[PDB]
Write a protein that binds this ligand. Sequence first.
Ligand code: HEM
Length: 391
Amino acid sequence: ASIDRELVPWSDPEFRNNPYPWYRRLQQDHPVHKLEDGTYLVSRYADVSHFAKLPIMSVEPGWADAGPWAVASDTALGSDPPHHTVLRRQTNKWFTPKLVDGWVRTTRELVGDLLDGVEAGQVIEARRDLAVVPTHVTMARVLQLPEDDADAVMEAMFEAMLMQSAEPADGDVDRAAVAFGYLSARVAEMLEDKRVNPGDGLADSLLDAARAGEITESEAIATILVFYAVGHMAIGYLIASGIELFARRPEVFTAFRNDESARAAIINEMVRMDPPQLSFLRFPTEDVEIGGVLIEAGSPIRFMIGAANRDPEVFDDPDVFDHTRPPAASRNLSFGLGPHSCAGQIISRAEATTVFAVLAERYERIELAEEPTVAHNDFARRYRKLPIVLS
Ligand code: HEM
């Protein structure tokens, strides 16, 4: 209780900015820690790896209770197998590598356009203009939905994410209700337009799957809304994080420039050191013993991704950025694992590669024009602004 505040002060500004020193104590001394409220924190790589992916780990109860976020219950994120596999089939077939090569053409075009527009030495707000809008429009093009709402989409997800903290402030649930009301209204308008003017994008595919009985109508519309809303979000964070990293560690940007074959490794090390999603929940459908601690069926288990990605039992010098870590020790948990591993992962890596590549094509050096403005919490990392100058 006061023990919980010492290990994981979820609301503390310092913990929120950089929890990683606290994660060490957790992982070393309290690897399976039961909080006050009943949630077990699981922070060792081995335990996250082995346990989070088990068939007994249900994703159902938390999202079903999540108020405004219950929309996730009608997607892969909040649905267990067997139906999980069928929801995932609906979108996986849209995001094979060859399909993704074509989708990220949009990413490349928009980045090139932005960069063509600038004057030498001009301050670029990299979070909106190189991260959020390119990825938002990329996904909207795949869906075949209108492309022009990135800014209000991003504000809405900013508001919807507040209640995902382990310690929501008063009113954060209400703010999420407002956010999801907006996204629902926008999706409803866009789908009425699509009934009268159908396309052949991922949104038309999902609607057809619901008409064909493969998924429900609610599941089609919830999947549309989620992919449309989050297309910019965690991927927008990874892009901005990598840009900041290129700026504070220019030898990394130079390596990315000089060595095409290192690119996937560099992006994967960025992803390891700064996951945008710091945990997820699971609800075991039967008792399970982890680290010698018996967790009862139904108890919340919060698997700590960020903490696990610095496990020194797996990663030597875990707080050191090193893109040369060997294949035997370069697997991180930032995209999850098991059947729920991120449904955006192949397009995410390709979008981040595209933006960094365009930058690499045109410049030698990234600098921060001022300190970045961030809005992190215990659950998700987030930039508000990332002013840069390219040379
Ligand atoms: C850097 C980018 C991203 C990271 C680091 C990330 C992280 C994650 C994590 C940690 C999970 C597992 C959640 C859990 O198991 O409860 C997840 C799942 C998911 N993500 Fe991503 N995410 C990213 C980008 C995206 C994008 C662009 C999309 C839009 C397609 C997306 C859509 C999803 C969906 C639908 C799931 C649920 C998959 C399932 O339950 O089978 N993500 N993501």
